Amino acid sequence: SHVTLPFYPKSPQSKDLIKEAILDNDFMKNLELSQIQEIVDCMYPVEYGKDSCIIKEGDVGSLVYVMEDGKVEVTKEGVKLCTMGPGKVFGELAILYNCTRTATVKTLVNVKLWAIDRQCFQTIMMR
Amino acid sequence: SHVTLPFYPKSPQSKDLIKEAILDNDFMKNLELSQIQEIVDCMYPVEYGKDSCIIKEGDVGSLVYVMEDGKVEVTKEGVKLCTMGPGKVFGELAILYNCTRTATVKTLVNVKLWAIDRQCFQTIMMRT
Ligand SMILES: Nc1ncnc2c1ncn2[C@@H]1O[C@@H]2COP(=O)(O)O[C@H]2[C@H]1O
């Protein structure tokens, strides 16, 4: 009758980094534990090498990311806004407020991320 | 019980200029009209004389501004980035990224602004 969310096995310390990264993000410090637990179980791993463009400002959004290793640079209109380290969320705006990517994310080093797709996250709001 | 956002009574003209500034921001046009209203109500007035620096690059962010009157010039690392007048929103970037101000805003003539602070600004974005 109702949808089933994909489940991705994780190390307990991965699980811990994701959660805490979520609590750290301004626009998600309002989520119920139950809901954060559902997010944590739903992210999947993705790696990018250095000099990689993950998010292009203007394109549409479908993935929200938590960074486990590495360091990324954020730019809007060729302007360096800031850099981001592990334990930080990003690419959340276009998923929450259904807009287009507000800036571009390039990698500086190799990075390992967690990512959750459009569909899954929506469902986790219906709580 | 949740928190209670402050109310700032406003001239209809102003309540409308602000709605304009917001709808013209290249990110905030995507907000629900309710959220836009809640914002409008939470803005409050600030005045600056000319040759004054409102936002300094590298600083911690706290306030988003809308501009009612005046001209301001946005810069960075010494370089100019654009003139700017009434109806525009600025200072959204540092809030949208829990990072630091990315530019330096200075007046050019006497200016008048509306300002929402970041706690209000985010409390509003957590809806519906
Ligand atoms: N290249 C640019 N063109 C126009 N406005 C800008 C530019 N860069 C920054 N700003 C504005 O200037 C503000 C300076 O502080 P913020 O980064 O918080 O938000 C910024 C934007 O509102």
Author numbering:
A (entry chain D): 92 to 218
B (entry chain A): 92 to 219
Provide excerpts from the study.
Our attempts to obtain crystal structures of an apo form of the CNBD-A yielded a partial apo structure, where two of the four molecules in the unit cell were bound by cAMP (CNBD-A:cAMPP43), which came from the E. coli cultures. Molecules without cAMP were bound by phosphate (CNBD-A:PO4), possibly due to high concentration of phosphate in the crystallizing solution. CNBD-A:PO4 superimposes well with CNBD-A:cAMPP43, except for the β4 and β5 strands. In the absence of cAMP, this region moves slightly away from the PBC resulting in a more open conformation. In contrast to our CNBD-A:cAMP complex, where a full electron density was seen for cAMP bound in two different configurations, only partial electron density was seen for each bound cAMP in two of the four molecules in the CNBD-A:cAMPP43 crystal, which accounts only for the sugar phosphate moiety and pyrimidine portion of the adenine ring. This partial density can be explained by either syn- or anti-configured cAMP indiscriminately binding to the cGMP pocket, since either configuration of cAMP can be fitted to the partial electron density. The phosphate molecule, binds the same site as the cyclic phosphates, with the same set of interactions. The partial-apo structure was crystallized in a P43 space group and contained four molecules per unit cell, showing a set of crystal contacts that are different from the PKG Iβ:cAMP and PKG Iβ:cGMP complexes. In the absence of cyclic nucleotides, the conformation of CNBD-A is similar to the cyclic-nucleotide bound forms; with the exception of the β4/β5 strands which are in an open conformation with respect to PBC, as seen in the PO4 bound structure. PKG Iβ:cGMP and partial-apo structures were subsequently solved at 2.9 Å and 2.75 Å respectively, using the fully refined structure of the PKG Iβ:cAMP complex as a molecular replacement model.
The cGMP-dependent protein kinases (PKG) belong to the family of serine/threonine kinases and are one of the major intracellular receptors for cGMP. Next, two cyclic-nucleotide binding domains (CNBD-A and CNBD-B) are followed by the catalytic domain. Binding of cGMP to the CNBDs is thought to induce a conformational change that activates the kinase by removing the autoinhibitory domain from the catalytic cleft, leaving the catalytic domain free to phosphorylate downstream substrates. To understand the overall architecture of the cGMP-binding domain and the molecular features required for cGMP binding, we determined crystal structures of the CNBD-A of human PKG I bound to cGMP, cAMP or in the absence of bound nucleotide.
